[PDB]
């Protein structure tokens, strides 16, 4: 549907289906990890308003479909890649100039989070702009996200 909760749930169902190795992943786990970052950033005064809206979830799903390997081998690794894609969404689409790393980091190896940032940007920077500039592309993505449920 058109609501944030629905699309978050489509996104969650998409991740369980893509990451077929993760037998104990719940489709609510990804919603829980994303809601948690957003509420944290708000309560700690990093943003005035929540980032998770319908357009931004579509934006996030566009990164995820192309970045998250079907071969992710643990729920922890999935959380780390998703949180990377989320951090890039905030940096690119968020209303604040900057966002802290802390809520987005779940790995002990910091260098790997940054390497993954650079590598997602090198794959995705063209599509990140295209989904803004091309309204029919935004529509295609929004439509695929809904058909995830």
């Amino acid at each position: 549907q058109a609501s944030t909760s629905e699309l978050l749930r489509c996104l969650g169902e998409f991740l369980c289906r893509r990451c077929y190795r993760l037998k104990h992943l719940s489709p609510t786990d990804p919603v829980l990890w994303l809601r948690s970052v957003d509420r944290s950033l708000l309560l700690q005064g990093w943003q005035d308003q929540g980032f998770i809206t319908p357009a931004n979830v579509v934006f996030l799903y566009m990164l995820c479909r192309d970045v998250i390997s079907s071969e992710v081998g643990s729920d922890h690794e999935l959380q780390a890649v998703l949180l990377t894609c989320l951090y890039l969404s905030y940096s690119y689409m968020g209303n604040e100039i900057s966002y802290p790393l802390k809520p987005f980091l779940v790995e002990s190896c910091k260098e790997a989070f940054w390497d993954r940032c650079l590598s997602v940007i090198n794959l995705m920077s063209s599509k990140m702009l295209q989904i803004n500039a091309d309204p029919h592309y935004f529509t295609q993505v929004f439509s695929d996200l809904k058909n995830e449920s």
Partner: protein, 288 residues
Amino acid sequence: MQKYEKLEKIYGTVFKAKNRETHEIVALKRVRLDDDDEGVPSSALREICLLKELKHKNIVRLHDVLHSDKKLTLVFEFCDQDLKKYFDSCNGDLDPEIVKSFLFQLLKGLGFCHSRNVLHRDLKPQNLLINRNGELKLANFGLARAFGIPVRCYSAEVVTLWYRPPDVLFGAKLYSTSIDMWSAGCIFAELANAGRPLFPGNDVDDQLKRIFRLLGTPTEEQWPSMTKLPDYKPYPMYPATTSLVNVVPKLNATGRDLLQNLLKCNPVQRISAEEALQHPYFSDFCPP
């Protein structure tokens, strides 16, 4: 950064350097990744994403991005100075052909950004780089963003005050490519005089007053949705009859016309970069 030799320092620290492999001179921006002050990397990442998609002779060119030690190293083409230093180097006194040349290049770069669906949002003389060849580049995309997607609003808090347009000063939460055209008009005014900010207000109220006092206060007919903006407040009605002649002495009637097209208070009436480039002020000129 093994590949590069730091020559001198000139959201991060900037160095002039040399590529050890080609001997070419570049600029290196270092972004610390283990900072004490959270934030910075986020804006660097947005800048890298945009700049990878904005290759134009008048946009500062990102060549590469290196990740080593607890830092991001952005490699750019080297430019000798920013417009601020340039104003200082020449007693704030530009020949009219250089005025025209700098506005032209600025509009081309800006035109390119807007046609790619990017808003710069921080146009000011220190974000404008000038080569020893006379080539100007828009730089510092840390505040920039892609637009096009449906959103309830953007940050109401963008552009240093002196370059911020009246709708944004009145708290408009949505704006378009118009926000940069206003700032480009402010810069045009600096170039065309003695290189000092046209509208140096000390706060929001003061800023709006400086603008209206020179340009006239917009009426309801020129700007019907004005009184509806979030931070709208009644201003005195300053007359529209004040001459711009002494404000921009390097300009004839043709440049003054272009300036007033850029400095329209109602954003929907501001000339676009592309139209401005077809204005008679650039009619003869050269770099076309």
